[model samples]
Structure formats: structure tokens, C-alpha cells
Target: SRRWFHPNITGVEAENLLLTRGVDGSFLARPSKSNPGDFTLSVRRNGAVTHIKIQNTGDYYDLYGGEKFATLAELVQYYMEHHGQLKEKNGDVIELKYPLNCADPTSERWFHGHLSGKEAEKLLTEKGKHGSFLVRESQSHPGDFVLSVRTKSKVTHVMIRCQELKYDVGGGERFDSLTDLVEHYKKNPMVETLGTVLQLKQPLNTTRINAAEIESRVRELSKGFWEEFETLQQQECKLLYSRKEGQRQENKNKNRYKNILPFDHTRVVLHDSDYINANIIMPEKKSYIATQGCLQNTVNDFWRMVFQENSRVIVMTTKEVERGKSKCVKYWPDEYALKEYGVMRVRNVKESAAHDYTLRELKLSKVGQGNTERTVWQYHFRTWPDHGVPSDPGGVLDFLEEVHHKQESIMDAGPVVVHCSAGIARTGTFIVIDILIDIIREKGVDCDIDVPKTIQMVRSQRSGMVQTEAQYRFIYMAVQHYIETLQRR
Candidate 1:
């Protein structure tokens, strides 16, 4: 009996075993069972098959289909030399030879390479005990091993395979040594590599714990026992809440108000006559003007505020009507139907409808400013329900990203005007999500997100910034979603 894993195998059996190993089935051929003495070997290259054949000559096998071999061992060796490996687009097999071949122990002597498979196993065994990567040989492919690393506490694998002249860092990335694969990802963190989660950092806490903490905070918010919240309603010059009659006729059930704050760092010259909304200044030189959804009579004042602030972004977080109730008025004129309000003429220049939101390019020009016109991008998030939150945070987050991309392109634009039906629930939710995301980007993911502290900061500028506990809870969810998105990238 032979000492090999499968000795004295017939051509059919040999081809089957080779296929079981790593030979591409699309390029393999077997001999007839009746004439078990002969077999053909080949691989598809470019557009044609590079074919070879072997026959049992007495006690030895002879290769004759394309190349010739003297003995059975030589034929078997040649079969292993050219089969089933990944190749480049032009039909050239990528050289995956490494100095760490298990069958060639002394191969490491030529290039002064790292370690043998056994040596690497021993080194990894010792180091893996101390919260480092774990390494093990792959069962299906010889001369290939799996390197495991921590990706956000979950184990992910990097398949390292050896070829004849170089090493394949699986996913078709070729390297001369394992060190190259390690250094490649270290230098280029953003590229998506196969079999490896590249350089992902752990979160400050696990997602479950983060979510639990948010729920606990929400429970505290739902208790309604905080005395400081009452004082927000009692602040002086607090336009709408203190005087409910100033609210829109159809929206009195929803308390919508804006603080009496001056813009451009002035006392009161540019403030809206009735103080229908408030401006929130962020650390990025970017700002937000939060207000109620447009009313039939207050539409003109809304345009005046937009014109005065020179705002280039308007984010509306509700539909015109939901559940048969009016949430906001259609403030802009239809295409080709130009509408003028006081000194501002608002006309829709272009409109694009998406699954979650509608984007409108509005041309705003003063009534007598000749040809000087400003283009304002309107992002209407239609799917967010009234007095409720989005089913998934992805829609709102994607919309925010589009808005931010546009906002960042313009360096000297004015504040972004964001509004909802009441302007305190969904509007506040959107703003808080944006601010928290900014903080996460400025700091690292491991940094804590102080939701209450940030909400308090926003509330100080505008009363009732985040209305319900549900909306508050949604902020934490949205932040987690955004952070995970960053990790994936």
C-alpha cells in the first residue's frame, strides 16, 4: 500500500479527489471507467483550456496531452502545480507561492522569511491567550490558514493562503509575506478587504448596553417629575407658548412657538415681527431656525425669515397632510406658477421625488431685485408620521446625510430652517440627531453621548426642543445606527 492520502487511485477517482481538493470543476476532465488507465488534466485560461493527459504505462504514469512527465509522482506533482487556483482576468494564474509552505520546511531559508506553520501556530497560541489574533490552518485548502481578529468583539477571519511564488491574502490580493497583509490594512483603513474586517474599533459600550441605557433615560423622562422642565415654559419673551392665541388657527392643539432672539448678533432689528421661530447656533458656524409648519397666514412671514437669514437649506419633516389632517401648508408655488409674498417671490425651479423624501430646488428673488436670485434646497421628509417617529432610523439618517452634503458644499450659507407640524417633536428629533452625529464625528465613537446635556443645551436656546420620550429614545437609536454605518464604511 502507498503512504499517500489516496494511493493507486484510478483516473476517475484521482480527478474526483483533485476536484475535492481545489481543482476548478469548470476545467476538470476524467477518464472513462472502462479505460481507467488514461486521464486528462486541464484548466481554463484566457478563453481556452490548457489541457494535458496521462496514461498508466505498466507501473508508471506518462503525461502526453500537452506536457510530458516521466513517473506517476511527477504527473501527480504537475497536477498540483497547475489547477483550480484563482487567476487574473487575462487567464494568468496569480502566483501565490510563499516561503511558508507546509510541504517545504526549508523554503524559509532562501528569503529569511518569518516562521513555519508550526512556529506560527506556537507563536499565535501564546499570543492569542492575551486578547490578540488567533491563527489556525484551513481544513479545505492546504498551505492556507485562517487569521482571526476582533471586530467590535465579534471574531472575523482573514484567509492567508500560500502559492508557488507568492502568497494570496484571499480575495485575490497577492502578497509576498503575511506581514504585507497586516501592514496593508494598517495603512489603508477604509478599503474593503475580503475575509477581513479592516481595522474596526470597538464601541465605548456594547450596542445592547447602549440601548438599555437609552431606554432607562427614556423612562426617567417619561416619569414627568422633573421640576426644571416647567421653567422652560415660563421663560420671558417666549413668543408662542405664553400667548397661545398667536399660534396657527388649525394648529392650536399643538403648541408651536419661536423665541424672541435677534439674528446677526443684533438686539431686535432683524427678528421676525411676531417671533414665530427661534435660531439655534451650532459649533460648526452652522445654525438651525426651528419653527412650526407653515400656516396659511404665516406663510409670508416664513419666506421673509428665509430671505432675511439668507438660508440655503430648508428641512421640512412632515407631509402637508397626514391621516386626513393638515400638518403644514404648501408654502412654495408650483412649477411655472410663480407666487410672490410681500418682497419675496418663491417659485419651484426643479423637483425630485424619492422614496423617503422630496427634494425641491426653489428660486427665491426679491420682488424688485432685478436678476439677483438665490437658490434654496428644500428637503421634505414625507415618511415621518405626525406625533410619531420613523419606523427605521436609516431613512432619516440618509436624508440628513444628503442635507449635510449639500450644506457643506456651500461655505458661507445661512442657517438651515427646519420645521414640522408642532416644530418641537419631529423637528427637535431631527436637529438633535444631526448635532449628536456631529459630536460623534468630532470626538471618537468611544466617547460618551450625553443626550440630556445636549438636549438641555438645545432647549436653552429654544423651548421644547425634544418633545416626547419616544423622540428622545429615537435619538439614541439614530446615533447608534450612524455609528454602525461608520464602522461598515
Candidate 2:
């Protein structure tokens, strides 16, 4: 079931494959050439290779100096889950962020071949509207399937039995294939005991795509994008959680737009001052702190949150002035020039530009208590927000590639800080794309990706992510663009 474990590749071959085919934090496991019966975990970090030995004693697989697991897969999985735990001889943390996944068990977008019932429930819970649904393989009797649907209030799972290459819903009305059965049920909804209804209205399609066949999937998506995007916007209206924290009289002035406010649950509460126009949005389990573009008076509070959050990367998607309005105020200093904000002093070391974006190296230190500087990278995407989404999603993709690589190069860094004017439209779009990019890079092209579901997830944490229809579609384009490059590599 695991394609990541290669048995024949040599250590040199592993390094070449990882260095060329994978980005930083990409890794694989292979049999050790130096020691028979042992294994080597070849990892790519900062454009180089690091091979860590895993001793296979025939009893269990152990990381030589550390924990033991019954199998190599479990050992690798444990390290990946426990971040900052795996280290080198020099005591540097080895990040296994992206797994260079090899292949998959299935290709059909609707068929989540190995999705767990608990996973389906949580995913459906996140945005499983009245009709949101997806089909997954039944683990206990996997030849059969479990059609999971969101029935307005909760997720309902219906078992699908297969016999002689035909599918049926445990009783009556059988079809030749799973697709036929799903389509028949989708057209004419079904009812189970207790008068429960299962209507397969919205398909929670997977983001996993087969590398060579990306073109057809992208083309097929064009047929249904409008309908899917519209339904999501409708579902978004019902996702209005309380924004009391940001709307309080004292915190109202911190927000750039009165209508735009962060949710109370996920808002980043500063130590000295609990209120700031900032919210935490975790798209792919990766922390991305989303906040409004700094105002003339709110610049100091912004820096305090950045320091408090321990963020090493800052992504700004808006220009200082756009459409004859001041989008974000100037906060950082000129190259080598120091400026104090609140209790912290920030100095810009260098500012460089790519065709699509710009990056500034900044040094930050607290005003008191034995100041020690931390270098923070600021990535400013020079994009024109034309009616919500940018004009070129490809340019945005390229800029994101650099931004993500920069973030990954740093070890044990904090969540990335992302912002635009109102922190909803462009900021959300940027975070969504970055998350999808991370998904593809980690799970490989064959893994499922749920764009609308991801947007729903982000909006739950902070309202109004991926705002416009154009912005919504831009995510598809960005994922498509990034996939094409990954396929090329």
C-alpha cells in the first residue's frame, strides 16, 4: 500500500531522485547499500541530501538512535507527525513536510478509495451542507463502498454492496458500476429507515490528480466550476459565526473595514493587547496567520502580533496604494535603517524583486529583556487585485513557489503571516492557493484535493476566504498551473 518505500534504489540513486524530483522536505525510504538488511531514509533539505539510517533488526524498524516501530512506515509516519523531533548529528531539525508520494489506489475523483469513516465525518462536518456528499471505500469489506452524504444537520453513511461487478444499496435497485448507482441515486434521491434521506447533491471531489492526465481533469472541471462555485457561495451564507471580538467598540477601529472582522474563536489574542485585526487560518494543518493590511495607527500592533506569533515569514498580497486608496501603510524600514514599533525594533536588511513578486529581509528584536535578533522574511506579491482575483494565476503560482521554498528552508519556524487590505478577499485567495500547493507537493499528484471543502474550512476559521467567483476559479487555475510544473519535474 505504500509506494514511498522503495526496495531496489541505491543511496546515490535515491539522492538523485530526491534532489531532482522532489523539493525540500521531500523524502523516501530505501534499502541501505552500506549495511545489508538495514534501510536508509534519504531526505532532501535546502537543495541537498541527508541519508539517515534506519536499523532493521528483523524484529522492528528503529531510527538507529531513537524510537522503534513495528514497521518502517510507522517510524516515518511518527516522525512526520511529531515535528521538530527528528534531528541530525549537528542538532538541526529535519523537517519531513512533503512526502514525494509515488502513486495511488484509485483515479476516479468521486471515489475516495481509502478515506476513513471518521475522516469523512469530520470533512463533512466542516462543510457537509444539506447535500454535500462523497463516496469512500469501506475498510472492513472494502470491495463494497460507503456513500457518505451530509443531510442538512449531520453526515449519513449508506453501505453499498457489490456482487458480480454490480453495485446496490444493500437492498434493491442494483447498477452495473458504482458510478451508475451514484448517478441513479443522485437523480432520484433515496430514503433509508426512520425516513432518513440521502441526496448526493454536491460531490466533495478529491484534489488528487494523476500526473500525466491532469489536462483532462482541468478541462472536465471547467464544465462544472460555475455550478460548484455558486452552490458553495450559497452554503457560505449559512456559515456565519459570531464576530463579537472584532466588532467590540474598542476593537472596531483596528479593522480596516467595519463589515470585515475576524471570528472570536480563531482570532490571535496578543499578550499585552488582546485585540488586533488578525485571525489564524490553518488551510492544510499548516498555520497561516491572516490579518488586515496595517493602518496608519495600527502598525505597531501588527509588529507585536508578528513577534508574538513567532512568525518567520510575512506574505503581503496588496500594494501600499491601489485604486487611489491606501491599502497598507509603510511599516518596515529602508535597507539597513532601523525603526522602532511598540516594544520591538525592525530593520530592513535587503529588498529584492522578482518579475512577479518582491522579498525583503528584516531583522527584529524586542526593545528590552536582552535583545536577540530574529531574521524574518517578507514576501510581497506585486499583484493588481482586479475585481477580487489577480489577472495572472500563473504569476501568483510562481511567486508562491518561491515563498513556500523560502519558508521551508528555515527550520522549526512559526506560522506564516499573510495579509491584504481587508484580509478576506486576496489574503484568503493567497492562503488557499498556498495550501493547495502544499497539498500537491506533499501528497503528490494522485491524492484527492477538495477545493470548495478547503475554502469552507478556511471560512469557518475566518469568514470570507476565496470571496468572489473569480477568486474561487483562480484557485483551480493556480492548482492546475502548479500541477503542470510538478508533472514536468
Whole-model lDDT per candidate? 0.55, 0.75
Q: How accurate is candidate 2 locally (lDDT)?
A: 0.75
Would you list the clashing residue pairs of candidate 1? Answer: 96-163, 96-166, 97-163, 97-164, 97-165, 97-166
Question: Which regions of candidate 1 are displaced past 4 Å?
Answer: 1-274, 281-284
- Total clashing pairs for each candidate: 6, 6
For residues 1-489, write the lDDT of model 2, one tens digit per residue. 244655456888888889888999899876677885577888899999988888743223558545554345445655777333788777778887776643221323456768899998887787447888888889879688898888828778889998886789887787866766776898899987788877787676444345446567668877666545544543443465667787588886887765466778999998965888778887644689988889887988988888888888999988756668687898899887989997899989999978767889999888985466788999988765534466667888888888788888888788899998777777888898888879878888886677877887987887667655566778888887888877778
Number of the predicted model whose lDDT against the real structure is largest: 2
TM-score, predicted candidate 1 vs. hidden true structure: 0.48
Model 2 bad stretches (over 4 Å):
1-213, 385-391
Best by TM-score: 2
lDDT of 1 by residue, 1-489 (tens): 001212123455454444444333234433424443355544433333444555643212344533332222233333445442434456555321211111221111111133344554444343333224434566557667655544424444567777765666656577655545544554554334465435523111111223324445445555632222222222211222222323345433323322112222211124435444445546325678777687677777788878888789999987767788677888988865778987789888888999999999998878888585888999998887544477789999999999988988877888888987656557778898998877666675666566655665675555446655456567877887887778667
For residue 416, give model 1's deviation from the true position in Å.
0.5
